[PDB]
Scaffold this active site. Structure first.
Site, PDB file in Angstrom:
ATOM      1  N   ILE A   1      63.621 -28.351 -17.116  1.00  0.00           N
ATOM      2  CA  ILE A   1      64.748 -28.138 -18.048  1.00  0.00           C
ATOM      3  C   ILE A   1      64.317 -26.861 -18.933  1.00  0.00           C
ATOM      4  O   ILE A   1      64.904 -26.570 -20.111  1.00  0.00           O
ATOM      5  CB  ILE A   1      65.124 -29.408 -18.878  1.00  0.00           C
TER       6      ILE A   1
ATOM      7  N   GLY B   1      53.842 -22.974 -19.384  1.00  0.00           N
ATOM      8  CA  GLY B   1      54.150 -24.124 -18.444  1.00  0.00           C
ATOM      9  C   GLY B   1      55.652 -24.407 -18.606  1.00  0.00           C
ATOM     10  O   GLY B   1      56.382 -23.790 -19.437  1.00  0.00           O
ATOM     11  N   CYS B   2      56.130 -25.156 -17.681  1.00  0.00           N
ATOM     12  CA  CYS B   2      57.375 -25.492 -17.578  1.00  0.00           C
ATOM     13  C   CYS B   2      57.730 -26.905 -18.647  1.00  0.00           C
ATOM     14  O   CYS B   2      56.887 -27.316 -18.942  1.00  0.00           O
ATOM     15  CB  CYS B   2      57.959 -25.956 -16.303  1.00  0.00           C
ATOM     16  N   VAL B   3      58.987 -26.933 -18.854  1.00  0.00           N
ATOM     17  CA  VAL B   3      59.622 -28.095 -19.567  1.00  0.00           C
ATOM     18  C   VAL B   3      60.238 -29.137 -18.703  1.00  0.00           C
ATOM     19  O   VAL B   3      60.792 -28.937 -17.858  1.00  0.00           O
ATOM     20  CB  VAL B   3      60.707 -27.781 -20.631  1.00  0.00           C
TER      21      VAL B   3
ATOM     22  N   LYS C   1      56.941 -30.419 -22.760  1.00  0.00           N
ATOM     23  CA  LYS C   1      56.489 -29.032 -22.575  1.00  0.00           C
ATOM     24  C   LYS C   1      54.923 -29.003 -22.043  1.00  0.00           C
ATOM     25  O   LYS C   1      54.184 -29.459 -22.897  1.00  0.00           O
ATOM     26  CB  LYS C   1      56.553 -28.243 -23.769  1.00  0.00           C
TER      27      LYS C   1
ATOM     28  N   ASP D   1      60.348 -15.233 -33.859  1.00  0.00           N
ATOM     29  CA  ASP D   1      61.019 -15.126 -32.500  1.00  0.00           C
ATOM     30  C   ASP D   1      62.566 -15.741 -32.737  1.00  0.00           C
ATOM     31  O   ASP D   1      62.713 -16.590 -31.841  1.00  0.00           O
ATOM     32  CB  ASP D   1      60.146 -15.560 -31.331  1.00  0.00           C
TER      33      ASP D   1
ATOM     34  N   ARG E   1      68.669 -17.729 -27.812  1.00  0.00           N
ATOM     35  CA  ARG E   1      67.762 -18.195 -26.621  1.00  0.00           C
ATOM     36  C   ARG E   1      66.709 -19.230 -27.140  1.00  0.00           C
ATOM     37  O   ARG E   1      66.520 -20.385 -26.362  1.00  0.00           O
ATOM     38  CB  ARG E   1      67.122 -17.237 -25.835  1.00  0.00           C
ATOM     39  N   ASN E   2      66.560 -19.167 -28.433  1.00  0.00           N
ATOM     40  CA  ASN E   2      65.559 -19.940 -28.949  1.00  0.00           C
ATOM     41  C   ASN E   2      65.943 -20.950 -30.122  1.00  0.00           C
ATOM     42  O   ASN E   2      65.138 -21.324 -31.010  1.00  0.00           O
ATOM     43  CB  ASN E   2      64.364 -19.070 -29.619  1.00  0.00           C
TER      44      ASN E   2
ATOM     45  N   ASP F   1      61.583 -22.815 -30.507  1.00  0.00           N
ATOM     46  CA  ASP F   1      60.613 -22.107 -30.091  1.00  0.00           C
ATOM     47  C   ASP F   1      59.553 -21.509 -31.066  1.00  0.00           C
ATOM     48  O   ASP F   1      59.388 -20.316 -31.535  1.00  0.00           O
ATOM     49  CB  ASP F   1      61.217 -20.575 -29.451  1.00  0.00           C
TER      50      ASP F   1
HETATM   51  O1  LIG Z   1      65.992 -30.215 -23.936  1.00  0.00           O
HETATM   52  C1  LIG Z   1      65.090 -29.288 -24.260  1.00  0.00           C
HETATM   53  C2  LIG Z   1      64.444 -28.285 -23.289  1.00  0.00           C
HETATM   54  C3  LIG Z   1      63.588 -27.249 -23.524  1.00  0.00           C
HETATM   55  C4  LIG Z   1      62.639 -27.506 -24.965  1.00  0.00           C
HETATM   56  C5  LIG Z   1      61.718 -26.753 -25.165  1.00  0.00           C
HETATM   57  C6  LIG Z   1      61.927 -25.464 -26.147  1.00  0.00           C
HETATM   58  N1  LIG Z   1      61.571 -25.303 -27.205  1.00  0.00           N
HETATM   59  N2  LIG Z   1      62.113 -24.105 -28.032  1.00  0.00           N
HETATM   60  C7  LIG Z   1      62.821 -23.654 -27.029  1.00  0.00           C
HETATM   61  N3  LIG Z   1      63.560 -22.797 -27.331  1.00  0.00           N
HETATM   62  C8  LIG Z   1      64.091 -22.323 -26.110  1.00  0.00           C
HETATM   63  C9  LIG Z   1      64.113 -22.971 -24.975  1.00  0.00           C
HETATM   64  C10 LIG Z   1      65.113 -22.553 -23.852  1.00  0.00           C
HETATM   65  C11 LIG Z   1      65.617 -21.242 -23.692  1.00  0.00           C
HETATM   66  C12 LIG Z   1      66.296 -21.046 -22.387  1.00  0.00           C
HETATM   67  C13 LIG Z   1      66.454 -21.857 -21.392  1.00  0.00           C
HETATM   68  F1  LIG Z   1      67.265 -21.535 -20.274  1.00  0.00           F
HETATM   69  C14 LIG Z   1      65.942 -23.058 -21.505  1.00  0.00           C
HETATM   70  C15 LIG Z   1      65.178 -23.471 -22.741  1.00  0.00           C
HETATM   71  N4  LIG Z   1      63.413 -23.858 -24.906  1.00  0.00           N
HETATM   72  N5  LIG Z   1      62.870 -24.661 -25.911  1.00  0.00           N
HETATM   73  C16 LIG Z   1      62.982 -28.652 -25.629  1.00  0.00           C
HETATM   74  C17 LIG Z   1      64.171 -29.364 -25.246  1.00  0.00           C
END
Ligand SMILES: Oc1ccc(Cc2nnc3ncc(-c4ccc(F)cc4)nn23)cc1
Length: 289
Positions: free
Chosen positions: A33, A39-41, A55, A149, A153-154, A167
Site C-alpha cells: 500500500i 522499504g515498502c508499506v 512500514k 517535506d 503526496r505526503n 511522511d
Molecule cells: O495506509 C497507509 C499507507 C502508507 C503509509 C505510510 C506513509 N507515511 N507517510 C506517508 N506519506 C505518503 C505515503 C504514500 C504516498 C503515495 C502513495 F501512492 C502511497 C503512500 N505513505 N506514507 C501509512 C498508512
C-alpha cells in the site's frame, strides 16, 4: 538482522516505550500500500484485531543508518493531534530491520485521492482538506518540529476523511521518486519544487520554509493534484524563484486563497504567515462556502 545491544541505550529506552511484540502483528507482504526507498508499506493487522500499515525498513541494512533513522524519528511517539499521523509502535525481531507500525489510512494519500476522477472533490472539499493540513502543521510548529517535506503526496486520508500530515518521523521516506531531485546544493534527493528559495540557497529548513511548502500544497489541492512547475526544469527552479516568478492561480482557486498562496512564497521568510495565521485565514475562506 539487527541487534539491540549495538544501539545507544537512551535510544533503546525511548523505543521500548512503543515496542510491539511480533506475535501481536500479522503482515500481508503480498498487499503493498506504499513504496519507499527504505522499504515498502504493507497491510497489517495488530492484535482484538486492528487494521494497520506496516512500514518496512529492510532496505536499511547498516546499524549506523538504522540508529540515525530511529533517533531522528522516535519523537513521533510524543506527538498527538487529529491532523498528524500517529505512531502505533515499532516491532523489533531477531531477523530483519525494525518494522514501523502506523494507523491504516483507508483513503491513501491526499494527492491520489484528489486526482481520482470518480471523487471529483469540490472547491469546498479541497479547501477543507487544506484547512486540516494547516491545523496539523500548526501543531507540529508549536512543537518546534520542522517537517521538511510537506506536500499533498505526503498527507494521508483516514476512513473518516480526516487528513493526517504524514511522511515524517519514523514514517519518513520518498514515496514518489519522481518528485525528488539531486539537482541541488546538498546533492541529496530533495523535493526541490516544494522547497523555499532560501532552502535551495542555504540548505537550511525552518517552519517558515514549511509554510512555503504548504503554499505549494494548497496549489496542488486547487488543481486537484497537478504537478507544480511542469515546464520548469529542476535545473532552473532556483533562478525561476529568484526572478520573482511563482505558481499561477488555478482556475478554480478563489482569489483570497491565491493571496494566501502568494504570502506563503514571499522571498523574506519572516514575512510569511505562521501556520496559526493560516488556520485563521483559511478558516474564514472556508466558511464563506
Ligand atoms: O495506509 C497507509 C499507507 C502508507 C503509509 C505510510 C506513509 N507515511 N507517510 C506517508 N506519506 C505518503 C505515503 C504514500 C504516498 C503515495 C502513495 F501512492 C502511497 C503512500 N505513505 N506514507 C501509512 C498508512
Amino acid at each position: 538482522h539487527i541487534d539491540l545491544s549495538a544501539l545507544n541505550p537512551e535510544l533503546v529506552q525511548a523505543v521500548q516505550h512503543v515496542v510491539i511484540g511480533p506475535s501481536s502483528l500479522i503482515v500481508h507482504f503480498n498487499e503493498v500500500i506504499g513504496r519507499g526507498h527504505f522499504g515498502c508499506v504493507y497491510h497489517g493487522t495488530l492484535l482484538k484485531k486492528i487494521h494497520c500499515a506496516v512500514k518496512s525498513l529492510n532496505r536499511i541494512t547498516d546499524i549506523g543508518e538504522v540508529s540515525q533513522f530511529l533517533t531522528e524519528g522516535i519523537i513521533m511517539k510524543d506527538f498527538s493531534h487529529p491532523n498528524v499521523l500517529s505512531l502505533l509502535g515499532i516491532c523489533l525481531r531477531s531477523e530483519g530491520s525494525p518494522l514501523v507500525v502506523l494507523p491504516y489510512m483507508k483513503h491513501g494519500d491526499l494527492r491520489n485521492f484528489i486526482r481520482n476522477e470518480t471523487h471529483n472533490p469540490t472547491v469546498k472539499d479541497l479547501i477543507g482538506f487544506g484547512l486540516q493540513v494547516a491545523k496539523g502543521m500548526k501543531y507540529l510548529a508549536s512543537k518546534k518540529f520542522v517537517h521538511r517535506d510537506l506536500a499533498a503526496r505526503n498527507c494521508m486520508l483516514d476512513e473518516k476523511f480526516t487528513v493526517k500530515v504524514a511522511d515524517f518521523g519514523l514514517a519518513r521516506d520518498m514515496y514518489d521518486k519522481e518528485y525528488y531531485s539531486v539537482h541541488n546544493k546538498t546533492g541529496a534527493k530533495l523535493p526541490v519544487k516544494w522547497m523555499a528559495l532560501e532552502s535551495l540557497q542555504t540548505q537550511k529548513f525552518t517552519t517558515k520554509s514549511d509554510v512555503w511548502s504548504f503554499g505549494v500544497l494548497l496549489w496542488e489541492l486547487m488543481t486537484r493534484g497537478a504537478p507544480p512547475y511542469p515546464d520548469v526544469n529542476t535545473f532552473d527552479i532556483t533562478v525561476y524563484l529568484l526572478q520573482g516568478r511563482r505558481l499561477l492561480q488555478p482556475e478554480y482557486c478563489p482569489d483570497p486563497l491565491y493571496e494566501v498562496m502568494l504570502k506563503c512564497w514571499h522571498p523574506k521568510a519572516e514575512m510569511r504567515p505562521s501556520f496559526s495565521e493560516l488556520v485563521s485565514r483559511i478558516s474564514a475562506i472556508f466558511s464563506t462556502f
